[PDB]
Amino acid sequence: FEEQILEAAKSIAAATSALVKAASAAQRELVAQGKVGAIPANALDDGQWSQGLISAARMVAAATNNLCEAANAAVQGHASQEKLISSAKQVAASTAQLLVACKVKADQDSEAMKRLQAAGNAVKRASDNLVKAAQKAAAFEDQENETVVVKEKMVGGIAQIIAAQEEMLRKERELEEARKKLAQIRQQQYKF
Amino acid sequence: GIAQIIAAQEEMLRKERELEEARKKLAQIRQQQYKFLPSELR
Amino acid sequence: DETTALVCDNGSGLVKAGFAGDDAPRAVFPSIVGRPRHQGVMVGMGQKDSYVGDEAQSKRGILTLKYPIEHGIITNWDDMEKIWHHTFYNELRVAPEEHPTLLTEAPLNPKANREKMTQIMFETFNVPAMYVAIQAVLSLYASGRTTGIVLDSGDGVTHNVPIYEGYALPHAIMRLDLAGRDLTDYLMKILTERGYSFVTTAEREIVRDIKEKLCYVALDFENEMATAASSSSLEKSYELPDGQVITIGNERFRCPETLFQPSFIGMESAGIHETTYNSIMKCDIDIRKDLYANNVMSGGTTMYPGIADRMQKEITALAPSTMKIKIIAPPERKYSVWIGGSILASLSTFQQMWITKQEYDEAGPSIVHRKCF
Amino acid sequence: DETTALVCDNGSGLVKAGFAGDDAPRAVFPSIVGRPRHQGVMVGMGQKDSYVGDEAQSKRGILTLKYPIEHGIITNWDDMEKIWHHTFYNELRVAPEEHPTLLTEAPLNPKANREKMTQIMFETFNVPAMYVAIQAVLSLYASGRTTGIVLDSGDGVTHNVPIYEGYALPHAIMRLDLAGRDLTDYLMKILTERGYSFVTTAEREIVRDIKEKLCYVALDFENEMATAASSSSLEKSYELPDGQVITIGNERFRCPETLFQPSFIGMESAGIHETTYNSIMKCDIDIRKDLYANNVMSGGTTMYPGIADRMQKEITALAPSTMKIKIIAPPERKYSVWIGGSILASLSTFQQMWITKQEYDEAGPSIVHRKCF
Amino acid sequence: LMKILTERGYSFVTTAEREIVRDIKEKLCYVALDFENEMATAASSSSLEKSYELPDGQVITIGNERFRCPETLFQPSFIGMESAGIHETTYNSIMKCDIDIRKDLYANNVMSGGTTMYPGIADRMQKEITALAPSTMKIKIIAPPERKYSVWIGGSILASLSTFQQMWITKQEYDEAGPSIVHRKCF
Ligand SMILES: Nc1ncnc2c1ncn2[C@@H]1O[C@H](COP(=O)(O)OP(=O)(O)O)[C@@H](O)[C@H]1O
Ligand SMILES: Nc1ncnc2c1ncn2[C@@H]1O[C@H](COP(=O)(O)OP(=O)(O)O)[C@@H](O)[C@H]1O
Ligand SMILES: [Mg+2]
Ligand SMILES: [Mg+2]
């Protein structure tokens, strides 16, 4: 249960250490070939690309550390299973950004490119493994109590369908507002 | 910074679960629609 | 848990009142106020000033019956207030000041009618909250649909309201004053042809009973007239309250035919089928199909045997041949409006639509035009 | 292995979205935003604020439909963001923050349009990378060619882009606002000539369907007009959503004729054949033979029956008799642009052309003018 | 106007009652300069209420319906039509023209027909188009007092011209070309 995700957590840690090493090597290649003028200055502290791709790798590591903490909270019963997939999606976005950033800024068949791509794919697949392990271990993986409910009264039944259908439209309003809030907080994240 | 983003994703996904179960509830009502609806009303 | 709401459909001819959540009105009684028109001679009896509802219907021999509601418009406010008091305290036997009250109204009614209803509900009966709904919307609620053109024909008002996916089309709303009471008057006029003279209001009630018991809508008016003129199989008999027996022939279908030929009573308007077709044709072209497939009927006037088949034939003759015409006529449609109101009064969502007396006291009776359609 | 890229052709009329490597878009839906224009009465429904895509196409009766893209230029950015939502989360049902997104744009578009597209794609959806390609180049990619002049006629923009051996000639790029939507408007105008009145946006969609079902390009306009005026063979019928049947004659080929005679809608510009010929003549003399031999048509507006033959005849009449003119009109050209994008999104070399969000963060939205043609 | 007169309890149904309502419209309706301020004034004061005697002797009193009826010309959504008001249609028609002639069109807005005889319609049209057009442009609404007969007067002027005498569709041309000749000689 908790030991299962811990093994996958250590797999996550090893894969992210591989990411750190590969990103450092790629940064060495970029500064050696003059692809980018790397500056050893921590702009906006870590930021996202202070001193280059190493900051992106570090932020990926922070995101996956948050993912591991979320998995631990779930296996302790304090985090919803939808927290795990949200943190995993953030980690996937981060590693995709790092991989694409290194992809266009380096040589076509650079060996460091291959190391970064393989290591990022490893982190992605191991993240899905950890997420599925935590969700299946979670007792709230599948649960529903809405199989069949009926009302004898003709008035009661139609009122029942109308209440459920209003619940439809209310949750759909929640769709709109929640997405708009997420979009606003993404725009405010850096605002260029 | 990323804490707000992950929190917004939390709300989005939990509400997605809510929307899905609401869909299930609506369909679950709909299969028994014939029961309290007369024949001419299906 | 929550205090149940009162649903009171004040029709032109009948009052249907009950509690939200119930599947049938608890009190259905005629909306008449009778006053004695003779001289009382014995001290023990004959001293009451006015009789309301079924009490007046049992004493029509010595009473002058008056309907406070004419063509959906309340004309005598003292009488209507008396009827509401009789509904709350004698029929329902509840305190109106602890239950929110849902009232109904025909579309395109005068604004003063709705404002006076609100003021009476809040200052005379002191209800916690109240709401005026449109009868056609409630009728659509009762049928468990969100799309359709409702043809509500009561005692004083007939109206077509088209609704698509919960949206009403106010420009396409049709209102025709021909209704059950006009049919009763025309039945009196044509019953004079056989030598039966009904003049007094009690005789009007007798003719209304005859209409409810023996009248029906003919599938083809000309063929039915020819059959009645040749055979004698349509001659039905009816026993008057004094034992006299009357026999009526073509009048059984010549009276409801006024709904499809208003020119019988000197009205220039077109029949209910043409009004329905015109209301559909005033809607957007993309929703005409769904309206054609969801013709909803409600009200007592639509209880005539064979009215659905006649309406289907007429609209099929009017509409393009490709589209399918379906008349939805449930057997309980005479209460459909009220039933719909009950549903609307039981919804948790509707609990925010009430006009509370806080809003009434801060905004006045004009608040009813900002919160009710 | 690698994360697949998203290809989203944001046409003026239709949105075609899918994944790189696929041979057909996974989500093709109209790019419209509909808002209710009536009053909602039922409380259990009629409550959503805006409908996007096919949903709006199913509810056009009660909606005002607006295209956020007009003449290839995005005018309503909130509506465009809503459409991108409906594409990513509902139709494709993916997370844009893990897939690079390839977008398309007509040539000679305003710079602010492209900058706002980049800013929205990076700050609202947080895609790892993005790229804005020229639709004609993608259309050439789809045909497996490196040389040819592409005539791309979408819903809002018709542009000619000549390309020779992978090199574009920007000075020879021609753009014309005359496109499918203008053809639909002209069809409405000339359908009023037979007594059919289409006014609302829903009726505009109906007329667009009529155009897509019955219109064709005449090989010879004058002879076709004479034939239509003498015989009635060209007359064709069509059933409206309400069941009415309309019959159109010469309007079947007068609407697409605007493509070749823009003066029909009062525009001074020359027809598509003359614009293509002028674009070819603006190129170097040594490549005109190949450009003549590699005319590639793409876009929905080029799906008219017989348009290829008419274009071939017109350009043959314009070009010298020695040149060999070949119009390449693949049967799947309505998706050609998208298909080309898919190909471009699957190439290993193009993986170095992405605009990563690192560059966007360090250089701002202006970076899209240093990395995209 | 019939539909909104039902709001005060006046029921006009027959075609004759439609003619009566048309007369009421011609006698009492006007266009408000500012619709919202006019509605507030009508809801506050009774100065906008006017009386009218029906052919049967009954006297009706109408308030905001005097200006709420012609306002449909500027807000067609009042009758469920999706189209824009007359001011927006005029502005769109001007914007559909060539850029070089928009100035002269802006300065030569000509109104005609009975429906343009409403008191104060010219001022409302001028204000709306000024709000739509660029501030620099000068806008002039030409509303002659006899504009209810402008079409007929122009027809008389045209038919009195010697040059127009050659544009007559003669019944000679009709007999050889049929009714279709009217699509070749008239705009
Ligand atoms: N079975 C019936 N057949 C024909 N007419 C009927 C029947 N039942 C009721 N009616 C007519 O319908 C009218 C009552 O309609 P109702 O639905 O009560 O309308 P309201 O909303 O005015 O109460 C009465 O005047 C009566 O004449
Ligand atoms: N089979 C057809 N025949 C004629 N016109 C068509 C056909 N299919 C689509 N169209 C027109 O083409 C337009 C869509 O073109 P499309 O290639 O989707 O352009 P965009 O790139 O703007 O999406 C529509 O407006 C429609 O009117
Ligand atoms: Mg009723
Ligand atoms: Mg296109």
Assign 3-class secondary structure to B1-42: CHHHHHHHHHHHHHHHHHHHHHHHHHHHHHHCCCCCCCHHHC
Q: Which residue has the tokens 């496109």?
A: D179
Nearest CA in chain A to D94: A89
* Rounded Cα distance, D135 and D344, in Å: 11
Q: Going by CA atoms, what residue is nearest to atom 4 of ligand 2?
A: D212
Angle, CA of C304, C307 and C313, to the nearest 5°:
170
Binding site membership of D333 for ligand 2 (Cβ less than 6 Å): no
Binding site membership of C303 for ligand 1 (Cβ less than 6 Å): yes
CB neighbours (10 Å) of residue A48?
21
CA–centroid distance, C154 to ligand 1, in Å, is 6
* Rounded Cα distance, C191 and C214, in Å: 13
List Cβ<8 Å contacts ≥24 apart for D327-333.
D327/D295, D327/D297, D328/D143, D328/D145, D328/D148, D328/D294, D328/D295, D328/D296, D328/D297, D329/D297, D329/D302, D330/D142, D330/D143, D333/D139, D333/D297, D333/D298, D333/D299, D333/D302, D333/D303
Ligand nearest to the CA of C14: 1
CATH of the domain at E17: 3.90.640.10
Do C17 and C126 reside in the same domain of the chain? yes
Contact by Cβ (8 Å): D126, D88: no
Assign 3-class secondary structure to C232-296: CCCCEEEECCCCCEEEECCHHHHCHHHHCCHHHHCCCCCCHHHHHHHHHHCCCHHHHHHHHCCEE
Chains interfacing with C (3 or more CB pairs < 8 Å):
A, B, D, E
The tokens describing A88, both together, are 């995993």
Binding site membership of D303 for ligand 2 (Cβ less than 6 Å): yes
Binding site membership of D13 for ligand 2 (Cβ less than 6 Å): yes
Residue C94 burial by Cβ neighbours in a 10 Å radius (0-12, 13-18, 19+): middle
DSSP classification of residue D91: I
Do D187 and D247 reside in the same domain of the chain? yes
Number of domains into which chain D is organized: 4
Q: What is the CA radius of gyration of chain B?
A: 18
Q: Phi then psi for A42, rounded to 5 degrees?
A: -85, 80
C34 bridge partner residues: C51, C65
> Which letter, b or e, does each residue of C196-219 get, where b requires 16 or more Cβ atoms within 10 Å of its Cβ?
bebeebbbbbbbbebbeebbbbbe
Do D110 and D257 reside in the same domain of the chain? no
Do D46 and D190 reside in the same domain of the chain? no
* Rounded Cα distance, A102 and D143, in Å: 32
Q: Could you tell me how many residues make up chain B?
A: 42
Do D293 and D146 reside in the same domain of the chain? yes
Do C154 and C108 reside in the same domain of the chain? no
Give the helix/strand (H/E) hosting C176. strand C174-176
C157 closest CA partner among C185, C133, C173, C181: C181
Q: Could you tell me how many residues make up chain E?
A: 187
C121 closest CA partner among C349, C361, C347: C361
Handedness of CA D203, D209, D213, D217 (dihedral sign): positive
- For every residue of C55-98, DSSP letters joined together read HHHH-GGGEEEE-SEETTEE--HHHHHHHHHIIIIIIS---GGG
* Rounded Cα distance, B41 and C312, in Å: 16
CA–centroid distance, C150 to ligand 3, in Å, is 12
Do D103 and D19 reside in the same domain of the chain? yes
Contacts of D55 by beta carbon, 8 Å cutoff, 6+ apart: D34
- For every residue of D111-159, DSSP letters joined together read HHHHHHHHHHHHHTS--SEEEEEEHHHHHHHHTT-SSEEEEEE-SS-EE
The tokens describing D207, both together, are 């007329």
Strands C295-298 and C327-328: parallel
Q: Could you tell me how many residues make up chain C?
A: 373
Do C198 and C326 reside in the same domain of the chain? no
Do C291 and C171 reside in the same domain of the chain? yes
| Cβ contact C339–A154 (<8 Å) | yes
The tokens describing D54, both together, are 């096919």
Experimental technique used? cryo-EM
C225: three-class secondary structure by DSSP: helix
Residue D23 burial by Cβ neighbours in a 10 Å radius (0-12, 13-18, 19+): exposed
| Cβ contact A146–B28 (<8 Å) | yes
Do D169 and D95 reside in the same domain of the chain? no
Give one word for C31, left, alpha or beta, with left for phi > 0 and alpha for psi -120 to 50: beta
C324: three-class secondary structure by DSSP: coil
Contacts of A22 by beta carbon, 8 Å cutoff, 6+ apart: A112, A115, A116, A119
* Rounded Cα distance, A166 and D45, in Å: 7
Q: Could you tell me how many residues make up chain D?
A: 373
Contact by Cβ (8 Å): C34, C50: yes
| Cβ contact A187–D100 (<8 Å) | no
D102 closest CA partner among D78, D135, D151: D135
| Cβ contact C108–E8 (<8 Å) | no
D197 bridge partner residues: none
Do D139 and D280 reside in the same domain of the chain? yes
Last residue of a domain, one of C249, C265, C281: C265
D72 closest CA partner among D104, D42, D118, D96: D104
Contacts of D309 by beta carbon, 8 Å cutoff, 6+ apart: D217, D219
Contact by Cβ (8 Å): C26, C91: yes
Contact by Cβ (8 Å): C251, C191: yes
- Of chain D residues 38-77, which have a CB less than 8 A from chain E? 38, 64
Contact by Cβ (8 Å): D311, D327: yes
D17 bridge partner residues: D8, D27
- For every residue of A47-89, DSSP letters joined together read TTTTTTHHHHHHHHHHHHHHHHHHHHHHHTT-S-HHHHHHHHH
List Cβ<8 Å contacts ≥24 apart for D243-246.
D243/C288, D243/C289, D243/C319, D243/C320, D243/C321, D243/C322, D243/C323, D244/C320, D245/C320, D246/D191, D246/D194, D246/D196, D246/D210
The tokens describing C153, both together, are 């024909």
* Rounded Cα distance, C253 and C211, in Å: 10
- For every residue of E124-156, DSSP letters joined together read HHHHHHHHHS-TTS---EE--TTGGGHHHHHHH
Handedness of CA B24, B27, B29, B31 (dihedral sign): negative
Do C19 and C75 reside in the same domain of the chain? yes
C326: three-class secondary structure by DSSP: coil
C7 closest CA partner among B36, A161, A155: A155
Contact by Cβ (8 Å): E129, E90: yes
The tokens describing D355, both together, are 């605009």
Q: How far is CA D81 from CA C224, D17, D68, D92, D95, in A?
A: 64, 15, 9, 15, 15
* Rounded Cα distance, E47 and E37, in Å: 14
Suggest the residue from E78, E82, E89, E101 to mutate for an interface test with chain D (most D CBs closer than 10 A): E82
* Rounded Cα distance, D149 and D161, in Å: 5
CATH of the domain at C41: 2.30.36.70
The tokens describing C138, both together, are 């409630």
Q: Phi then psi for C18, rounded to 5 degrees?
A: -175, -170
The tokens describing A25, both together, are 């090597």
- Could you tell me the residue range of the domain that residue D99 belongs to? 2-32+69-132+335-369
In single-letter form, the type of residue at position C295 comes to N
CATH of the domain at D109: 3.30.420.40
Handedness of CA D109, D112, D114, D120 (dihedral sign): negative
Alpha helices in chain D (DSSP H): 54-58, 77-85, 111-123, 135-142, 180-191, 201-214, 221-230, 251-257, 272-281, 288-293, 307-318, 336-346, 357-363, 368-371
Handedness of CA E96, E102, E106, E107 (dihedral sign): negative
DSSP classification of residue E75: -
Q: Phi then psi for C161, rounded to 5 degrees?
A: -125, 115
* Rounded Cα distance, D53 and D34, in Å: 8
DSSP classification of residue D95: -
Contact by Cβ (8 Å): A56, A30: no
* Rounded Cα distance, E184 and D3, in Å: 64
D40 bridge partner residues: C167
Q: Phi then psi for A119, rounded to 5 degrees?
A: -65, -40
* Rounded Cα distance, E48 and E40, in Å: 11
Residue E101 burial by Cβ neighbours in a 10 Å radius (0-12, 13-18, 19+): exposed
> Which letter, b or e, does each residue of C279-298 get, where b requires 16 or more Cβ atoms within 10 Å of its Cβ?
bbebbbbbbbbbbbebbbbb
* Rounded Cα distance, C236 and C228, in Å: 11
E33 bridge partner residues: none
* Rounded Cα distance, C54 and C28, in Å: 9
- For every residue of chain A, DSSP letters joined together read -HHHHHHHHHHHHHHHHHHHHHHHHHHHHHHHHTSS------TTTTTTTTTTHHHHHHHHHHHHHHHHHHHHHHHTT-S-HHHHHHHHHHHHHHHHHHHHHHHHHS-TT-HHHHHHHHHHHHHHHHHHHHHHHHHHHSTTSS----S----SSHHHHHHHHHHHHHHHHHHHHHHHHHHHHHHHHHHHHH--
| Cβ contact C73–E9 (<8 Å) | yes
